[PDB]
Amino acid sequence: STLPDLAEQFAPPDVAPPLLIKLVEAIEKKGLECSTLYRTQSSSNPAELRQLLDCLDLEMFDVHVLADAFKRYLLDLPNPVIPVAVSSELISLAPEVQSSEEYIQLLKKLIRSPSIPHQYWLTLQYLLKHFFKLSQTSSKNLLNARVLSELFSPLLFRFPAASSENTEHLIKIIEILISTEW
Amino acid sequence: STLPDLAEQFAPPDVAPPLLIKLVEAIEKKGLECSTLYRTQSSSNPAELRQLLDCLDLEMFDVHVLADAFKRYLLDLPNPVIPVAVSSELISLAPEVQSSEEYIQLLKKLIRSPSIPHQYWLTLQYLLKHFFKLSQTSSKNLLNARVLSELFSPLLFRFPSENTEHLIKIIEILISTEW
């Protein structure tokens, strides 16, 4: 709620918000092989999770609380990781643009826009690297790139839009961007 | 011009872009009493000045080159220190609003908007503090708040006159009241 804009939480040469780095690193240390990571609700309500995003070493918390605070963080950003300026344009694309490569090309062009601080694209890259690392231990945590896209795309885009071949295309590019991180 | 956005050059808790801090501190050390500071074209062309901003100690440079790089920096920012949305609103209120105190109240409200990264207001505050320090030795450098406003308002607002006079007056007053 009081979470500052991504552009105010860090700046190059740093690669991601320091709070998001703590969350991701704690979650990867404690939950990389957890087969319900990001798929089960913890006991804590949003007000308790928000308390966590201010105050301690995060490795001290239950991994399912960290996973919920991670989702809480993405929801409480004043503007989503993928700004609506970008989402609005991607949703407007015609059926004749069928190439996932084209959607990805446009996402990168728009999000790298000078009207959008570089921090947004940097944060997304950091998240994609996290999702890719999780998908590499899928034999144990059961997380592939597509499931991760379906779980987190609504948090990254924060867009209420009726499910179309457009919304399916947003989910698909996130899927592709996770798979092709390395 | 590869100069990054103000919001990409630093973030809280830092108070201003590190490159702008280096420029300001060097200029204040070498030119605080210079009767022509910021009013003389130096020898260098824009490409040479950009080399200096795309990088070792700035005190090694001629003060008139530093002053030109300072202006070059403000000109090369992808977005001006005072965003165009803010300038556009202040200009459209020009005939109907005549009060200086109201314009100042509005500039602060608009630039502090949540849609505008905090770095812009922080940079403007840093610049105003520099301009005020210069005006304290105006008897020697001839830079008072009015002259400083006329020189730098077009760079801060990025406007090539008439509706502008209210903008210039805002900066003048903001320089004067740094306390």
Residue numbers in the entry:
A (entry chain A): 113 to 167, 172 to 298
B (entry chain B): 113 to 167, 172 to 276, 280 to 298
From the paper:
The N-terminal domains of p85α include an SH3 domain, capable of binding to proline-rich sequences, and a BH (breakpoint cluster region homology) domain. In addition, the p85α BH domain, either alone or together with the SH3 domain, can bind to and positively regulate PTEN activity.
We crystalized the wild type bovine p85α BH domain (105–319) and solved its structure to 2.25 Å resolution. X-ray diffraction data collection and structure refinement statistics for bovine p85α (105–319) wild type is provided in Supplementary Table S1. The BH domain dimers observed within the crystal structures are mediated by reciprocal interactions between M176 from one monomer fitting into a hydrophobic pocket created by L161, 177 (Ile in human, Phe in bovine), and V181 in the other monomer. The buried surface area in the bovine p85α BH–BH crystal lattice is 535 Å2, similar to in the human p85α BH–BH crystal lattice (527 Å2).
